[PDB]
Structure 1
Amino acid sequence: CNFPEYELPELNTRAFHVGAFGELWRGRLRGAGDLSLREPPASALPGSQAADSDREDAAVARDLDCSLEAAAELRAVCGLDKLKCLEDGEDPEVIPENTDLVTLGVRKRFLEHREETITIDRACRQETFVYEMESHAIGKKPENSADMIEEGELILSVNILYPVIFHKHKEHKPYQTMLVLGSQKLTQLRDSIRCVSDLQIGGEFSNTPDQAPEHISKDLYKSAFFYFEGTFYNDKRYPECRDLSRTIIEWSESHDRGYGKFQTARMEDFTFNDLCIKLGFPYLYCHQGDCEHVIVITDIRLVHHDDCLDRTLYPLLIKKHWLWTRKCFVCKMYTARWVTNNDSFAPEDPCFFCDVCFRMLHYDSEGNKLGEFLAYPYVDPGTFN
């Protein structure tokens, strides 16, 4: 049955149907209310539990099959005064010395060698994006009723890798993490992508630099498809969209290329609940016909009242890797906007130029072409990352 298990330790899991998995999760939670989106009561010190005692002791007695006095005794025993070694007025910026923790000892070792004038700072720890996009959306609610997450809705964590891979490291990957709902279709995920592959442009305009093409790649081609468990999900909402998967099925199935039989289907025909997908196992998405993306279902879980309940942000970005700007070779500090080939002035081919370093170098006051070269408008993937 749909019983998640590790195919490999902490790397990937077995395949299961998302809808059946969500139904199983709800069946173990429906009626209990632990999957609800309403704020429940929270634990407190025994000196203030009197107000909540009336509402809590009876339920505790019912669930634990103990007496009301036994429930009160358990509540008094399990009070936070027995656990709160830290008072509520203590700042987290200083290590409490009255401790026996090895973890805090290692923390002290880390902090002591970062207090010198050369080392003391409040800079980034190891990354910044995750908390910034968590606190910006965690615990919030939408301004419109139609943008309400359904109670018990599945939350799927999807990692989309960039087209610019390091091709020098293999442990870590360049990717951005998108959160999607089970009921959502793949169309809303595809339309939410802001990859630079949608912004690609071209054309040789060394003679007339001001005649750059009017239409970006997104305005000329709209082909995009997902690929899960051997199924292609190709967009066809627009005439610019083409079923790219037919060429792949023609090429691959004609020979033993190392992959099995595939099937073709439209992009809007399936929701995230209809997928039978693995977790952690990479999958394929493609758009523009040459921009492939690695798709990893990192995590899946039911919605929680403390999560982002605002659907206007969904698909919600939570994590993102960084790409560095491609800067021109003239001033070696400004991000390039043009690329040239066969350039007599440039020391190397290809050479990257910024608008400032491009126009006045390759043209005079009247804009007349100088020297021999070919020029193309350039969009930096490291900028629009």
Structure 2
Amino acid sequence: CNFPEYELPELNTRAFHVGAFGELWRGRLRGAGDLSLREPPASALPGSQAADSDREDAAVARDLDCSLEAAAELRAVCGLDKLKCLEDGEDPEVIPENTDLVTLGVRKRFLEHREETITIDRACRQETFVYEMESHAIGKKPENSADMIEEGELILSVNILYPVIFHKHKEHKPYQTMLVLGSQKLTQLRDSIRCVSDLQIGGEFSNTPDQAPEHISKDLYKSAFFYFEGTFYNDKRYPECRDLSRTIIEWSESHDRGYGKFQTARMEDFTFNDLCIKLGFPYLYCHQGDCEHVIVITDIRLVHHDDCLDRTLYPLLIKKHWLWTRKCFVCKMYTARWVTNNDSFAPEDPCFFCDVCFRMLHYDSEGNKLGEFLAYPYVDPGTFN
């Protein structure tokens, strides 16, 4: 069945079909309205429930199979005054001393040792990006009706790992996390990806540095594909696209290289609902022929009224990882725009140069080449990350 379950606890799940999985949610939620994108009433203190009583008591009596007076009793009984140890207005910035929590004692040990001139600051907590992604998008609705999430829509969370693996650490991962819609297609996720590999450029231009190539790799090549459950999904919307799946298969299935038989679909063939997939299992996306991305589905769920409902922001970026810039070797403070080989001036080969440093060191007042070296323009993936 398309019934989720762990294969490895808290690490990956057993496979299920996305569309049937969404319908399994909605078979338990459709008509009930809990999946709706419309604002419901909420709790309050028992002293101000009078206005909501006329609407709440009857429904509570219906659902709990009790009387109206029993519903009113339960409503006043379960008021938030029984739980609000914090008054409405107390700030979170200070630990309330009127507590017995072990958690708040440990928090006391965290905070008190920072209260010194060497450590007093309001800097980052552990990481920066996530709440910025939430706050700018959460609870918003679109300006266009065509960019409005359907009620009960499946919301997927996909981690796209960077091609630059840390290669000294394997526990934590370099990635940016992306939300996609069940009804949407792979085309939209591929188009939304801003990866630096599309910006790849080259060519040797030590003699004429200003004749840097006019075309980025995106203008020269457009091949890209996802891969799930043994199926490649290759783009063929443009003449710069090539179905890489054929060549991969033609070599991989020639021997018992350790992988199963694969099949070929196009990128535009599948919506995210059409997949049969596992959560947490490593999958593959590749583009520009060489930039392989490890794809991990980290969450999938129905939409809710508190979510970001503005599809102009979708596919929605929700997390990112912070690569370092390639600073020039000359000044060591500034990111390089050039890289040189066989350089008679540089102490090492290769050597990275910022635009200014490159130009003064290797050229005279008229731009004439000085010394022996080869030069290449450089776009920094540690900057364009």
Deviation per residue, 1:230-284 (Å, 9 max, x gap): 0000000000000001110000000000001000111000000000010010100
Q: 2:200: which partner in 1?
A: 200
How many residues matched?
385
Q: 2:52: which partner in 1?
A: 52
The 2-side partners of 1:125 and 1:266 are apart by 43
TM-superposed CA distance for 1:321, in Å, is: 0.5
The 2-side partners of 1:257 and 1:313 are apart by 42
TM-superposed CA distance for 1:89, in Å, is: 1.3
TM-superposed CA distance for 1:4, in Å, is: 0.3
Deviation per residue, 1:51-98 (Å, 9 max, x gap): 100000000000000000000000000000000000011010000011
Deviation per residue, 1:294-315 (Å, 9 max, x gap): 0000000000100000000100
The 1-side partners of 2:101 and 2:327 are apart by 48
The 1-side partners of 2:256 and 2:214 are apart by 43
TM-superposed CA distance for 1:40, in Å, is: 0.4
Q: 1:379: which partner in 2?
A: 379
The 1-side partners of 2:267 and 2:119 are apart by 52
TM-score between both structures, scaled by the size of structure 2: 1.00
The 2-side partners of 1:33 and 1:74 are apart by 23
TM-superposed CA distance for 1:121, in Å, is: 0.4
The 2-side partners of 1:214 and 1:351 are apart by 24
The 2-side partners of 1:8 and 1:15 are apart by 12
Deviation per residue, 1:329-376 (Å, 9 max, x gap): 000000000000000100000000000100111000011100000000
TM alignment of 1:14-163, pairs within 5 A: 14-163=14-163
Pair 1:228 & 2:228 matched: yes
Unpaired stretches in structure 1, ≥5 consecutive residues = none
The 1-side partners of 2:280 and 2:228 are apart by 13
The 1-side partners of 2:320 and 2:40 are apart by 32
The 2-side partners of 1:52 and 1:117 are apart by 51
The 1-side partners of 2:76 and 2:29 are apart by 28
Task: Give the secondary structure class of the aligned counterpart of 1:284.
Answer: strand
Task: Give the secondary structure class of the aligned counterpart of 2:219.
Answer: helix
The 2-side partners of 1:173 and 1:367 are apart by 44
The 1-side partners of 2:329 and 2:346 are apart by 9
Q: Please list every run of at least 4 consecutive aligned residues from structure 1 whose deviation after the TM superposition is greater than 4 angstroms.
A: none
TM-superposed CA distance for 1:168, in Å, is: 0.3
The 1-side partners of 2:98 and 2:311 are apart by 45
Task: Give the secondary structure class of the aligned counterpart of 2:339.
Answer: strand
Deviation per residue, 1:195-229 (Å, 9 max, x gap): 00000000000000000000000000000000000
Q: 2:216: which partner in 1?
A: 216
CA RMSD of aligned residues (A): 0.4
Unpaired stretches in structure 2, ≥5 consecutive residues = none
Task: Give the secondary structure class of the aligned counterpart of 1:124.
Answer: coil
Deviation per residue, 1:137-174 (Å, 9 max, x gap): 00000000000100000000000011111100011010
TM alignment of 1:232-311, pairs within 5 A: 232-311=232-311
The 2-side partners of 1:69 and 1:360 are apart by 87
TM-superposed CA distance for 1:107, in Å, is: 0.1
The 2-side partners of 1:245 and 1:354 are apart by 39
